């Protein structure tokens, strides 16, 4: 290739503007580049991972530096309940004087932004107290970023390139990751918690210059190597303990108390240290499973080959799957993305109900922002997991080497799978929408007692099995004489039950008929999104409408107007369709979370209990009611500090609307219009002196779908982010 | 009339001039340089 892109000769000879657009859009698709080999593929990916790590380190270093330079961390650690954390300063020449006055918050001397990422609480909990600590953390992170870049450059050199066989040594990598990357890192973290964080919460200041002179525990490694580990749990912090001071401070370093800290409303630090020690032990044990160099361990290939049921109902079982997984990077990426997307939602659901950072729980805006952020990230990752699974079937799947194993039988009964998913989604949608409309009609006619309100009894029974006593079920932990409650009677049940039965935290919130309908809406969204993605993945290789789909690739526009029409027939188009459903589903769960929490923080849960049973309640008491302060950020009488979010609300609306243009109007209309503009330019005096070098053409069919989806998603994210932050920050719950 | 020299000179000198002018701006020219002049407003629930 003589021009750009240099990795695609076919794109380089394109005489239109499309050469540029596509060159940007296919930069990281190394598999489709000119003269590509497997060794080059693996080495390029290995190098790119180092750059991604360097970017991650630089971002954290920037955050730390700006908090230390322009923040109010030292004033915040003395009044966490009454000081607004500062992210960074503002220097905009476009600001007017009222904007300069309105944005001077905290204790700053100029316009600043209030941080809603929760970094202040996280850093305060882990022992950081002064601006110098953040300054020296930022330098270390910059050093790490530089070293990652250096390693990325080094392993690209001729004498340090790793071979393909090294990248395919799954057993050694699994052993090292399970034992070193997971186990040893957790042991180091609990070491930090024992040595710095826990002393820090009791008024002890431990740093690099004195950590070799201070005993983390009075007994000092005696009990550990003797065996009487209980001496590390004897004297925990009292319930009257104040965080950061020695008032009511104990000496224990590893406990099993359960529940929350009375003042900080978060998990005990000793419980966290014990948890990380236990997880480190578990991962260190698990990292000794696979055979590497010493004649002991397991072979994953033999394990997969030996797991064939003798009855023959699974065919050849898992035989041969080791080679398909090991030789396909898309299979590995899909598995990793599915697991990571599951645990991102797990983190989101566990962080709001079991806060781990000091004084996070009563910072409502930060909690809402974090939950929404992590749930939307999980939603995108889960779509990626299915997209790459679909790509695997086209590019890497070998039907002959996978004869009658568990992976071919899925393609065998794809129709049975897709039809049943369709039935489930249809049933859920029909009945949820019907119940919602019935309740709406009853509320319209002035007869709220005719509503169909189903009690979520299964989930209430599960809550009562965890010890909640608001429903009077008396099962398992809610019972007094059972074996389950008797077993943990004196270890963790007291604190856990006290936290669970405390009705002003987010631990097992009371649920009613309003939750039953929204949970089924969430289930319908999940089922429909999985239906779209699974249908796209299982039909990627071909169907009755297009038997030779695998011959055209993962992303192609169509097969033309013949055979009735073939719009959106490629597997990429299934992902493009499923992104809308993922966004809708995540919006539903975030609406539910935000409305359920904003009413609980206001002291009136009954507003949500009665108004969530019909959709007009959602429209009026959640959207309309909570947009009064946001839309008043700037008005003909002045402005306040909420003007940024008011501007971003309309910005997101505008981008969302602009995306509809690319999603509705298609290419030929625009190409025929661009022809006229080309003629007009060629016939205009004093403009004939200027000539284009790339022929102007309309956006491609697939390019326009991507552009419209990007605009749709950007508007969707920005509008809700502005609304959520402004609504939770106008009143602070 | 040297296009190679003109591009470098224009870009670098324009950037330096922009930085210098921004660094020499007074509070009368830019409200952001003047800074706040009013006592700060309090938070919704007593936060500062």
């Amino acid at each position: 290739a003589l021009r750009f892109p240099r990795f695609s000769q076919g794109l380089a000879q394109d005489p239109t503007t499309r050469r540029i657009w596509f060159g940007i859009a296919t930069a990281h698709d190394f598999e489709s580049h000119d003269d590509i080999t497997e060794e080059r593929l693996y080495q390029n990916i290995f190098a790119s991972h180092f750059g991604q790590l360097a970017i991650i380190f630089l971002w954290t270093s920037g955050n730390l530096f700006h908090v230390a330079w322009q923040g109010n961390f030292e004033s915040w650690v003395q009044d966490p309940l009454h000081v607004r954390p500062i992210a960074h300063a503002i220097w905009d020449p476009h600001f007017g004087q009222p904007a300069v006055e309105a944005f001077t918050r905290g204790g700053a001397l100029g316009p600043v932004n209030i941080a809603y990422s929760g970094v202040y609480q996280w850093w305060y909990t882990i022992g950081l107290r002064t601006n110098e600590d953040l300054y020296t953390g930022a330098l270390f992170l910059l050093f790490l970023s530089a070293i990652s870049l250096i390693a990325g450059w080094l392993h690209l050199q001729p004498k340090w390139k790793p071979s393909v066989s090294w990248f395919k040594n799954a057993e050694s990598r699994l052993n090292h990751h399970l034992s070193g990357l997971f186990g040893v890192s957790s042991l180091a973290w609990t070491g930090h918690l024992v040595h710095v964080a826990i002393p820090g919460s009791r008024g002890e200041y431990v740093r690099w210059n004195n950590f070799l002179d201070v005993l983390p525990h009075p007994q000092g490694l005696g009990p550990l190597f003797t065996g009487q580990w209980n001496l590390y749990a004897q004297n925990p912090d009292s319930s009257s303990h104040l965080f950061g001071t020695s008032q009511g401070a104990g000496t224990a370093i590893l406990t099993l108390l359960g529940g929350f800290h009375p003042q900080t409303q978060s998990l005990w630090l000793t419980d966290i240290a014990h948890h990380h020690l236990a997880i480190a032990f578990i991962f260190l044990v698990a990292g000794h499973m696979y055979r590497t160099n010493f004649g002991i361990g397991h072979s994953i290939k033999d394990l997969l080959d030996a797991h064939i049921p003798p009855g023959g109902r699974l065919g050849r079982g898992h035989k041969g799957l080791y080679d398909t997984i090991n030789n396909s990077l898309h299979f590995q990426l899909g598995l990793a993305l599915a697991s990571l997307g599951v645990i991102t939602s797990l983190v989101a659901q566990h962080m709001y109900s079991l806060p781990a950072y000091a004084f996070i729980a009563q910072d409502f805006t930060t909690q809402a922002a974090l939950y929404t952020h992590h749930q939307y990230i999980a939603g995108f990752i889960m779509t990626g997991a299915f997209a790459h699974g679909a790509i695997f079937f086209i590019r890497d799947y070998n039907p002959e080497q996978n004869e009658d194993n568990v992976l071919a039988r899925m393609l065998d009964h794809k129709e049975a799978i897709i039809s049943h998913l369709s039935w489930a989604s249809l049933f859920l949608g029909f009945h949820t929408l019907g119940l919602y409309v019935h309740n709406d009609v009853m509320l319209a006619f002035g007869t709220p007692e005719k509503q169909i309100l189903i009690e979520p009894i299964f989930a209430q029974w599960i809550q009562s099995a965890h010890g909640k006593t608001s429903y009077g079920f008396d099962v398992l932990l809610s019972s007094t004489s059972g074996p389950a409650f008797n077993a943990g009677r004196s270890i963790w049940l007291p604190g856990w039950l006290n936290a669970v039965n405390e009705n002003t935290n987010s631990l097992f919130l009371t649920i009613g008929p309003g939750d039953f309908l929204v949970h089924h809406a969430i289930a319908l969204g999940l089922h429909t999104t999985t239906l779209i993605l699974v249908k796209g993945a299982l039909d990627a290789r071909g169907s009755k409408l297009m038997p030779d789909k695998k011959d055209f690739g993962y992303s192609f526009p169509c097969d033309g107007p013949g055979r009735g029409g073939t719009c959106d027939i490629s597997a990429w188009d299934a992902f493009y369709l499923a992104v809308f459903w993922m966004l809708n589903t995540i919006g539903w769960v975030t609406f539910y979370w935000h409305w359920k929490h904003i009413t609980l923080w206001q002291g009136n849960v009954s507003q949500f209990n009665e108004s969530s049973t019909y959709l007009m309640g959602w429209l009026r008491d959640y959207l309309w009611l909570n947009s009064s302060q946001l839309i008043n950020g700037y008005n003909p009488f002045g402005m306040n500090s909420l003007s940024v979010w008011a501007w971003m609300f309309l910005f997101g609306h505008l981008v969302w609307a602009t995306g509809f243009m690319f999603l509705i109007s298609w290419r030929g209309y625009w190409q025929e219009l661009i022809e006229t503009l080309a003629w007009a330019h060629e016939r205009t005096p004093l403009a004939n002196l200027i000539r284009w070098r790339d022929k102007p053409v309309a956006l491609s069919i697939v390019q326009a779908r991507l552009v419209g989806l990007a605009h749709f998603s950007v508007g969707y994210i920005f509008t809700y982010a502005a609304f959520l932050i402004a609504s939770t920050s106008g009143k602070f719950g | 009339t040297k296009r190679g020299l003109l591009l470098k000179f224009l870009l670098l000198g324009g950037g330096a001039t922009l930085a210098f002018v921004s660094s020499q701006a007074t509070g009368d020219d830019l409200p952001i340089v003047k800074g706040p002049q009013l006592p700060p407003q309090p938070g919704p629930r007593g936060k500062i």
Partner: peptide, 29 residues
């Protein structure tokens, strides 16, 4: 001090230099 100098550099000068360089790169040959 620094923001009054750095903001014009990152917001105006650096994007202009990068755009000029990238345009000259993509118009090559």
């Amino acid at each position: 001090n620094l923001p009054s100098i750095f903001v014009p550099l990152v917001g105006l000068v650096f994007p202009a230099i990068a755009m000029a360089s990238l345009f000259l790169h993509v118009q090559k040959n």
